[PDB]
Motif scaffolding. Structure first.
Motif, short mmCIF file in Angstrom:
data_model
loop_
_atom_site.label_atom_id
_atom_site.label_comp_id
_atom_site.label_asym_id
_atom_site.label_seq_id
_atom_site.Cartn_x
_atom_site.Cartn_y
_atom_site.Cartn_z
N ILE A 134 1.50 1.17 -4.75
CA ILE A 134 0.76 2.24 -5.40
C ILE A 134 1.69 3.06 -6.29
O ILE A 134 1.31 3.48 -7.39
CB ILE A 134 0.07 3.13 -4.35
N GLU A 135 2.92 3.27 -5.83
CA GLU A 135 3.88 4.08 -6.57
C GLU A 135 4.28 3.43 -7.88
O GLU A 135 4.41 4.11 -8.91
CB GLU A 135 5.13 4.33 -5.71
N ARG A 160 0.81 -1.21 0.00
CA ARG A 160 0.00 0.00 0.00
C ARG A 160 0.84 1.26 0.00
O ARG A 160 0.28 2.36 0.08
CB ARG A 160 -0.96 -0.01 1.19
N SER A 161 2.16 1.13 -0.10
CA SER A 161 3.06 2.27 -0.27
C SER A 161 3.83 2.14 -1.58
O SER A 161 3.54 2.88 -2.53
CB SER A 161 4.01 2.38 0.93
#
Lengths: 456, 452
Positions: B378-379, B374-375
């Motif tokens: 997403i990127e 979720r970090s």
């Protein structure tokens, strides 16, 4: 108050479905009916094609839309209503979310695509016996059977809208902004300001216009004070304490400060944490458009009860709506007679993106095939066409012409990349039209494909 | 339209829905599976590519209009607030012909396609059945080169046949006829005018799905149509198809010495010119002349008729069409010329390394650490999207076997797994001989391009 089972109802139905159409109404249906120009249509094709390219990057597929269903009490007389033979009042879609929510509530259990877009028609009734006004709407929806990562799906929808902004000239170089709110926030504000439950849907509808097209808080106050809505002067005073927008960290602090000592605090706090999560995901997705928290956000809030609301706006001195959406889990549940959750936006892509006020440089047709010999036109011309089509080149046959001057006059309203003129003895004169520094070239017919390929 | 009829009408439109009716509307309804929807996207995308080569644009379709007397009770009929009986589209040609007759917008596109819905009425209170039809039309404003335009419509169908796997390796054929030919045959066979529409409807099934001449004769002689046995015998003299030169000879022989010979010959000359243009367009699918062609002939009065058939021992219809100039004139209130075809593209082409090897999503971004998913996940996602690569985020998973089991019903080209310190494990799923590879995150973009 009429008896719904009154036998006059069946009498008139069978009587009217037996009538053939009267000629005055048949002509009135589509008297002043106009079609978009073919240049409008090519613009519509470029927009739709660009939009689908964005949607497909996200793994989305096109889903079909509902065309007809029992009328909803959520619309007024400008929705189109129609009767079927057994007397049920039906409507055509007024937006696309109504039919989508009903479909998600009523369809048999089964897999549904997680990410989907749809292009459908929405309708407005006209009271002059003419046909309804029709508009193209596009929706992008994320539907899940689990309640995991609800804020992250919401941020992906905002991301898609941010990608659309970046892709089009009407939006790429103009100030846009997102304003986020939440149905639970609005209802708690209504609780805070002691707004009577029977007045909230009316209040939400007036607020949905706030600061759109110069509908300032004074106008809002008038309508909320009208006896058609009936909000007390004290309640409107309190609601005005929420008439602002701000960037998220600031806005979350203001809001907690407004609810500091109340019974509403814990619920508001849950709701602000959710918006915070959306805001943080939007940063991870690299949303370039400015995000504001607007606590009186209420566009279509009846559809979004219990979920986030958002609008995308033209952020100028006077603002207008580009697109709006939210999480409509609550609309799905309200239509159940299989848990499903959905967030999406709706957009009138033809009005916002296709009408003129680059991607629009694409030609309806690259090659015009012509000849001043009517018999060469209808033999060699045809043979060149099928060759060009076989190699993915867009091409069309010209009408007869006697001279280059007369050809370009006949085609004065068209725009090609090249005009190919077939001469005697298998020779082609090629006029380059997508520039003006390029001189006419005669080539052998056998080299047309190489010449066109090498030209690019 | 007495004040009687109004007051009841306004009260009808105010009446609340019966609960049983509201439930029956969509009780049991389904959507197509996500796999069907991706196949529909591929088919629709290929079709549009074909149409755009011809310079065509998508035209909008009428959704609602006053009911046509030509349809029966399986067309959807609805009452508007003024008591006019309207209908939903039963086919797309009716709406297009009405528009071409009732607008005055001067220039309309010469070549256009449209995707619309068509509807069939249900009896059990359920919502109408819906089907997606695609049309390709060529609209002209004078009577020049009508046969060339007709041959181009036929060539678009030939391009569709060659483009799709279900049609490009199956025997196919075109059968050409002509409404004037059909009506001259009816005259020759002494078929009364009131019976001709029912006759043409029966004949439209001839040799489709084992509907043999024996079955046709039964229906023609039945009260559904009511043709004499003599008339049916004479019609049987036209129960054949042949390649064009031989067909034209047989038809001229059948009509020789009749008052219809001149008009037949003129009509055969139009069909020959369509055939000659089809050879110049390099139409590859076999062309037959079938004098009893009659699909939707009432819409094609005065114009060519054509069908595209699967040409196995048992025949079925792929697409059909014709020139509907005559339907346009019949709707003028109290010139434009058009020819086109219609096709149920979902049923014929989307119903199931080829066009259908295209992936719904090329990259699945996964991680076995939920906070990395979720970090960093997403990127990488937004980075892939920004370079035109289709990608989606996996849900949480604890192991690659758990991830692959969870996503068993999907098909990606690559599964990217994010681990500690900007390391990606990339699993290649579109082949089978390719082992897993670990790379630096900053090279995902290069690594992917180095594979395609």
């Amino acid at each position: 108050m009429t008896d719904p089972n009154s036998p006059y109802f069946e009498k008139v139905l069978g009587s009217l479905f037996a009538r053939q159409v009267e000629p005055a109404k048949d002509y009135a249906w589509d008297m002043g009916s106009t079609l978009p120009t073919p240049d409008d249509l090519m613009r519509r094709f470029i927009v739709k094609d660009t939009l689908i390219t964005i949607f497909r990057r996200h793994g989305a597929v096109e889903a079909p839309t509902a065309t007809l269903y029992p009328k909803s009490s959520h619309y007024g007389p400008n929705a189109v209503h129609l009767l079927d033979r057994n007397g049920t009042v039906l409507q055509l879609p007024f937006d696309l979310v109504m039919g989508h929510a009903r479909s998600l509530a009523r369809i048999a259990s089964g897999p549904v695509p997680q990410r989907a877009y749809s292009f459908g028609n929405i309708f407005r009734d006209r009271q002059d016996g003419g046909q309804p006004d029709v508009y193209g709407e596009v929706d992008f929806d994320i539907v899940t059977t689990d309640a995991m990562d609800l804020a992250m799906k919401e941020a992906e929808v905002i991301k898609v809208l941010d990608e659309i902004i970046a892709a089009f000239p009407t939006t790429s170089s103009t100030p846009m902004c997102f304003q986020l709110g939440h149905s639970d926030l609005l209802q708690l504000i209504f609780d805070f300001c002691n707004v009577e439950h029977g007045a909230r849907q009316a209040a939400a509808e007036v607020l949905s216009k706030l600061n759109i097209r110069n509908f300032t808080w004074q106008k809002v106050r008038s309508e909320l004070r009208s006896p058609l809505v009936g909000i007390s002067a004290t309640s409107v005073d309190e609601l005005q304490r929420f008439d602002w927008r701000d960037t998220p960290t600031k806005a979350f602090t203001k809001i907690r400060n407004l609810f500091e000592g109340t019974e509403y605090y814990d619920k508001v706090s849950s709701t602000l944490a959710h918006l915070k999560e959306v805001y943080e995901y939007s940063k991870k997705f690299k949303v370039n458009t400015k995000i504001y928290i607007a606590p009186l956000s209420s566009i279509n809030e009846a559809f979004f009860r219990g979920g986030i609301l958002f609008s995308c706006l033209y952020d100028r001195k006077v603002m207008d709506v580009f697109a709006a959406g939210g999480r409509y889990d609550g609309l799905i549940k309200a239509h159940r007679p299989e848990e499903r959750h959905a967030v999406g936006f709706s957009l009138n892509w033809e009005k916002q993106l296709a009408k003129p006020v680059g991607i629009f440089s694409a030609k309806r047709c690259d090659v015009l095939v012509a000849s001043f010999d009517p018999s060469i036109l209808r033999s060699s011309g045809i043979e060149l066409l099928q060759m060009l089509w076989a190699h993915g080149i867009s091409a069309e046959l010209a009408r007869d012409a006697r001279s280059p001057e007369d050809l370009l006059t006949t085609y004065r309203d068209e725009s090609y990349s090249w005009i190919v003129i077939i001469k005697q003895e298998s020779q082609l004169k090629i006029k380059t039209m997508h520039r003006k520094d390029v001189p006419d070239a005669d080539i052998q017919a056998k080299d047309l494909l190489a010449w066109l390929k090498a030209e690019i």
